[PDB]
Symmetry: C2
Subunit: 450 residues, 2 copies
Amino acid sequence: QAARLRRRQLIRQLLERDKTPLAILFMAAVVGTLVGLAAVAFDKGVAWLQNQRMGALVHTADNYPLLLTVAFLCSAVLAMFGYFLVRKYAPEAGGSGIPEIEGALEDQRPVRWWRVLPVKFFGGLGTLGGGMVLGREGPTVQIGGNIGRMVLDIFRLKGDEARHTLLATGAAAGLAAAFNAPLAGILFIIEEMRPQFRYTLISIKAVFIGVIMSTIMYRIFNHEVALIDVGKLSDAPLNTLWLYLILGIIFGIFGPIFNKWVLGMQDLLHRVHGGNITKWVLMGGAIGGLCGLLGFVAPATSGGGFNLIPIATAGNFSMGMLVFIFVARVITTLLCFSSGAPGGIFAPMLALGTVLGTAFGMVAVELFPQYHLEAGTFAIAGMGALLAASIRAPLTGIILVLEMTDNYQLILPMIITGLGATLLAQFTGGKPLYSAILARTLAKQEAEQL
Amino acid sequence: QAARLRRRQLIRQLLERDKTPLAILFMAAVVGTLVGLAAVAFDKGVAWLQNQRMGALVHTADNYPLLLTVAFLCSAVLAMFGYFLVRKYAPEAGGSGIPEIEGALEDQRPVRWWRVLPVKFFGGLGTLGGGMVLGREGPTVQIGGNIGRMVLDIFRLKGDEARHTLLATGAAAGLAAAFNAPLAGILFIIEEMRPQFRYTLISIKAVFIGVIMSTIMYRIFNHEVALIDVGKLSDAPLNTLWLYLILGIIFGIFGPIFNKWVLGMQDLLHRVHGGNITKWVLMGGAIGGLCGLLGFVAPATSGGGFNLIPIATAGNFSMGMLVFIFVARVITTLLCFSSGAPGGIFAPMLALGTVLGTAFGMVAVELFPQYHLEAGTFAIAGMGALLAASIRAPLTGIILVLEMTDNYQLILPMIITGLGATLLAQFTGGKPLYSAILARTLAKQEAEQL
């Protein structure tokens, strides 16, 4: 008897499908333009801070320790400013922000646009211009979601659909304009950040409008220079796909170890300061001054993670340097992100994945010679593999790497590794990172209520 | 006040995420291999039948009307076989198949793998080798869904998640092996074919296994024959994006008119025969014969439409011929899909979109000289536009055209034309075609449920 009414409802629902009102479809363009302006202001600010920190070496270019000490000092105070702002005015700004946007899409974790926008925009600017290794997409995604919550009370719009829709398209535009990827912004909304346990009416056309009205405002400035440039590499033949599957096995068995390391280092770095604000700011300044000293000398194991990647793929880079770069980048990414720093972790995961991919490719080109292999394709194949192993977002983790490279023909070696890094991460016994940070924060929020 | 237990359940849900059983994840590989085998068997059979229908002219290459009438006769009987099959044995194999899989995934529309596979695999072979304007997409997606139901009663696997997951990965691999696109096959499922109103539990990873396990089986049998081969066209600068927006407005004002034309032609060709099986298969023979005739003479306005796109973009063509090609293609697609013949209207939408894109580009290169334009860019921007304006699937309509063309440098004109198509196809008042066909057959089912 239930089949009589569900078809009567399904006919009435299908004859009015994908019909979203013009109020939402126009308010999703102003948030796209605003996030597109704010993201390029963020990028110009971090580029200006990096340029002035690189130009500060010519003041005293004679003494080595007294030359690195002033770089350590400015990278320390530029991170203490951001840490002090985050711990004082809005403690929700810490971490990567994508778990709090995911929480705000499911009615917990209240977003405060009046409070957390001009502490994120001025704290992430400091701790990203200070040479720390953080992906500059996390603050842009949180800034996008909070600009979406800003322009819903500024223009006083009402409804239990608009506060899902504008909150989604802001966090789509923030991921689109931080990577110059106008498709990964949509595919990180419809795959990961949407609530996977409840049906919501997130307007996909409004997400489209916000993504293109932020990608246009990203491409008006800094015209067509990409964040990563590498030419059309060698095509991957059919008989070598099992090597990419083996790389997926390695990445999937590495992923949950990285998640356990991050979730343990968070407890350790919280225990070493005990909740004291001044001790936390001093520890953040010390841990950022490490990030800036390695940005000054031996500059490969620091920075945003986009000055290292295109020279590892199809480039001269020895394995003895490569294993040190991998170990040091694990250490300094674990120090940066797992310390409450305002900053996301996509670009360090992409850098770790492409360094381990270059390592596996340099192993395979000497171990299996009869395929006439190239070591450059394994870096592009394993770029979107640590994302598929630790975020468990293996469709946008492949679409982003296909987007920012313009190297199509290894889409099947990319997608094999993107599957095999999630199969042997589920069967290993891991959890997704951006769904575990939200669970930990929700447990900490609930356990305070006695 | 109700947040004393729902977030406590949300913590338990978020900790246990992406935990798919190994039985589902292993049954999602045998369906991938079987769809990858059946699709390339379908493609090799339709290629062989096209080869015999093309080599039949060598036997009688002296007389024009006696050469044309035997082509008319074989193209008529090759469609009468498919029409007689689809009307005698399984009447649910008509049309496209994606509505009869989307309705099957809503736990309506009962799947019959014992009855729909050996009618589609032998009738959609004949009506596509005969030369009708049908895609090889619908008959592969429906064969995929029926295989996904076949290996669930073969292995007698019981579940409330497996009967949607296998039915989803079959219709994922059916689109992935029809275009050599292992990303459009997933982005058709997680965007369009899933339940858009009810909360479902389609596991993303088990679609993701079967897509690559079908793409490998595709590429292992067809060596290197790409679908569409056009070179790297000139990238659109940011002062001519409004031309792609205007093309999107034209496509959006065309889209619902095309949908209403198809929906009207369905009732017209239903009323012209009145349920008579012999009159219907004679109508199918006439509509196959007067499409194989245009396959022989003036061969642009027939076929799947993939022997036309490299001539349309980056090729010499006249607008006075292109107008006739467009109107004849709309007439023959209207007469071929909307007549119950087993064939998807997906490739005759791609060909129509790139024809209208070339017709916009060859107007704009003359009307706007100072832009230093190139007419082949607008064809690639308009190929992914009729899907966004009539199927209203504007994400897979962009990812698929990015797959089978390999032109990333115009991804922003492509996405602008796609959403400018869906905006003026929503504000005109149209419905998506795959959600209108399902609503019409559900209403026809409710009519006979007295």
